[PDB]
């Protein structure tokens, strides 16, 4: 979609807070919002590509200010929702709980090892986008292309500040997860995807640095060829 | 920046302390979350990963010109030959700077980074000061807020990272560190280096 996340080219949102070191994990809330990522994933309530979904339908303002754990529990809830494993009138009163008694504890549960064994192979071995397809890559290093000016409403890859723009393939990475088609409960349809150079002259005008150029990663069906 | 609608940070936190502790109490009914998985999750990302492993990575590349090619050619499989590699750095692909190149990281659409060799990125990466400006400004950004001055003759490749393709940069070796050892070298390498927001440190 054409929300307020897609800031590339934005103006005007101040100067960049750089607290001179920080930590990891600013308060505990933090590694609580953090964990339940690979638990909400096994769990079956969205993919990566749902989750930023999820984010991306979040208050603007909110988004733009809030704390970013704060827009991870955000897409949980979207997803508790919308997938029907989260009871919004319950999630309400237990929030009301421990708004009033915040060092109540929390339910009593078994520290059940797979869910451990399961954060060590997630953390080491990965969860690989990348798959295999029959055909080849349509398009080349060094082919001329021109990103889609397509605006959907659903989840997408498509920043704003290069749609209809034309550029240079640059490498052909192999096929990946779609996001246009997982973020919005269409399934991974593979597609295969590039790194594409925009000049800076060609995305901004002559306001562009004469000495610096945009790579930007397209997958087969944004980009169309202009010259081979 | 100031917004006069906005309420105070302790107000916030409160109240997003009990908004979390709620969804995690449903969470651990239903058998999905447990203390344990969260304590091992903080515990690899605080002390087992972190850009420590990247600068492994970046000393061998300097000192060892056979494994910054294969670095350079499959930045996966190079880093997995040190045991480096996972979540979130499935695909990794490294850009070297150059007297003639330098390379700057950016996801303008979200926060995605390199975990296995940086860990959790810094809350200015994901915050959307940087990601606006970096795509347009990157030369006046590199001088205003990093110090970081790169001629206007230098062309500059900034590497928006709207993919499961993770960029990493491989910063320059500094000048006047001729035949020292790996250790002394990985003293030179920071995040802010890996990213191109800045050169490795000097002298």
New interface residues.
Partial sequence: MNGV???????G??????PAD?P??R?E?E??????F???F??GFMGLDEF?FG?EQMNP?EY?????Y?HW?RT??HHGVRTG??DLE??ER??????EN?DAP??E????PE??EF??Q?????????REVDRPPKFKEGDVVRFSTASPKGHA?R?R?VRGKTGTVV?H?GA??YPDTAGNGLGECPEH?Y?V?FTAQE??GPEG?P?????????EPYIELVDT | ?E?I??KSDEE???????????????????????????????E???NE?GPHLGAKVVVKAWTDPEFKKRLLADGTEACKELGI???????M?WVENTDEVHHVVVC????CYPW?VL??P???F????????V?????QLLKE?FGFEVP??????????????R?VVLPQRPAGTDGWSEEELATLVTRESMIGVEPAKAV
């Fill in positions: 996340y897609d800031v590339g080219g934005t103006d949102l101040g100067p960049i807070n750089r920080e990891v994990f308060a809330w590694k609580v919002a953090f964990a339940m690979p638990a909400t096994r769990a930023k984010i303002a733009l200010e809030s704390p970013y704060w529990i949980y809830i494993k989260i319950e999630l237990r929030t009301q709980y421990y708004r915040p929390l339910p549960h078994e520290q059940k869910l451990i954060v060590n997630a953390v080491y071995g990965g969860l690989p986008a990348s890859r920043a500040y490498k990475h990946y997860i995807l790194t150079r995305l901004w640095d000495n610096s150029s945009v790579y930007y990663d397209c997958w | 920046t917004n609608l906005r916030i936190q409160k109240e997003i302390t009990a908004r979390v502790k709620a969804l995690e109490s449903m969470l651990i009914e239903q058998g999905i979350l447990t203390t344990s998985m969260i304590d091992r999750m903080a690899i990302y605080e990963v590699g996972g979540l979130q750095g499935e695909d692909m303008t659409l979200c926060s296995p860990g959790l810094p809350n200015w994901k915050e959307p000061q940087y990601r606006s400006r795509v347009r400004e990157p030369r807020e206007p003759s230098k062309e500059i490749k900034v590497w928006d990272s709207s993919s499961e393709m960029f």
